[PDB]
Amino acid sequence: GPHSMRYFETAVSRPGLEEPRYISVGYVDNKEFVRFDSDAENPRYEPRAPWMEQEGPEYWERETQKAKGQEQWFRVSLRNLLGYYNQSAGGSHTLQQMSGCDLGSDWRLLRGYLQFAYEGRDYIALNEDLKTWTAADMAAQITRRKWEQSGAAEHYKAYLEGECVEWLHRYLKNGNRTDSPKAHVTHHPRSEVTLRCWALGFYPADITLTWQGEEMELVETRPAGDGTFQKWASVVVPLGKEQNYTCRVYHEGLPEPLTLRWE
């Protein structure tokens, strides 16, 4: 199966505040594994999965220092962006970053990722070639030329082809699953009766529910709060004829798609 690492970093400046509040969240295979928050009393990277408590105090000390570097970089960058967009003092602003690497089932690098958003909106992003930058905004051209002139891409590319893959291999070895959905249909009388197909206790979150021999209200997939997810799909059905309708759950942990009904 394929694998991935990501770091999602956020910096928020507010009027009343003085220095930005900076948060960095690390993920392996889309699950949170470390976290740093500058609002903490003694700010540092803390483990967020039990399998990371294997890492010794030199690992945490270095990571914490990298984060303090990021803190400096997001604060300065925020200051510069304030100038680029002619925004004055007195507002709240956000700078965000996503980086990391996707590996194939063979553990080789599939793709590097490096993207930045300002005010929730794409600012600049490293293209898949890890050589050129995409930057839509006129204001964002200043940053693109700055980064083309300094050679920044080569250095982010070295990180993404090297450290990201290297250290992802190490995390995969150290943290050596999926939970299949359990389905059931519920009956609710109305005007006609409502049949709502539930899938519960599944991980990861990717799922699809349908009703049928042809292909409706649903909810977006949601966390149960325990690590598992929920979803339901429901349909309007005339009374007495409810054995004719069939739900189908599709999930990557299922040997084959579920097919069930009201009973």
Partner: peptide, 9 residues
């Protein structure tokens, strides 16, 4: 292994 950014925006 957290990244470390290069040139500022």
């Amino acid at each position: 292994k957290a990244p470390s950014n290069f040139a500022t925006m």
